[PDB]
Amino acid sequence: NESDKLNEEAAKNIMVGNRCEVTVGAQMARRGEVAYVGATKFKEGVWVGVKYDEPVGKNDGSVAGVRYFDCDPKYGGFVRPVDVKVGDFPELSIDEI
């Protein structure tokens, strides 16, 4: 009950194309771009599909044979809106310093 409310609230400002940072549980934060926001076929509620900067995801934009977005293998992930912050989150990389 409380979780659905928290997820619905967090999703209101999450738009496809937004840069983002994903923090799932204990894991290291990972940045990418929002590729999907809304309901899916695999579980009820709101999901955020992310196209990650590094191959640190779990999918290729598809889950259970259903395509939701396009990306390379291991660059995609689906997480709950509460685990996603959107804003100016540029790619963590240093060319030369």
UniProtKB/Swiss-Prot annotation:
The chain holds residues 133 to 229 of 229 of the full protein. The gene is tbcb-1. It comes from the Eukaryota. Residues 38-80 form the CAP-Gly domain. Belongs to the TBCB family. It is found in: Cytoplasm; Cytoplasm, Cytoskeleton. Supercomplex made of cofactors A to E. Cofactors A and D function by capturing and stabilizing tubulin in a quasi-native conformation. Cofactor E binds to the cofactor D-tubulin complex; interaction with cofactor C then causes the release of tubulin polypeptides that are committed to the native state. Binds to alpha-tubulin folding intermediates after their interaction with cytosolic chaperonin in the pathway leading from newly synthesized tubulin to properly folded heterodimer. This is Tubulin-specific chaperone B. The lineage of its organism: Eukaryota, Metazoa, Ecdysozoa, Nematoda, Chromadorea.
